[PDB]
Amino acid sequence: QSDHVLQHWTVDISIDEHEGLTRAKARLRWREKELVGVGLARLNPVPEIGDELSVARALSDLGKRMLKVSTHDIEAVTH
């Protein structure tokens, strides 16, 4: 049975509800790096819904930033 090598990383998501808006910050630490993404939403566009929307936007932002960082970590090798 050929090898499956598994690792586990965590994104910590902080959600701050203030003045009718919600700001989510998604923080990923791995190896020797850290990246953050941020998203915002109206708290009530149910406040659960504002939370979900700001987190969706934060995770999208983090993924887009991580794709750009990945690309640069590649081109730093291949020049």
Binding residues for Cl ion, per CB under 5 A? 41-42, 45
Nearer to Cl ion, 11 or 21 (CB): 21
For the bound state, the minimum distance from the C-beta of residue 23 to Cl ion, rounded and expressed in Å, comes to: 11
For the bound state, the minimum distance from the C-beta of residue 56 to Cl ion, rounded and expressed in Å, comes to: 10
Query: Residue type for 16, please?
Result: D
Q: What are the residue ranges of helices labelled H in the chain?
A: 47-78
Contacts of 69 (CB under 8 A, 6+ apart): 33, 35
For the bound state, the minimum distance from the C-beta of residue 36 to Cl ion, rounded and expressed in Å, comes to: 20
Dihedral sign computed on CA atoms, order 30, 51, 18, 63: positive
Nearer to Cl ion, 20 or 30 (CB): 20
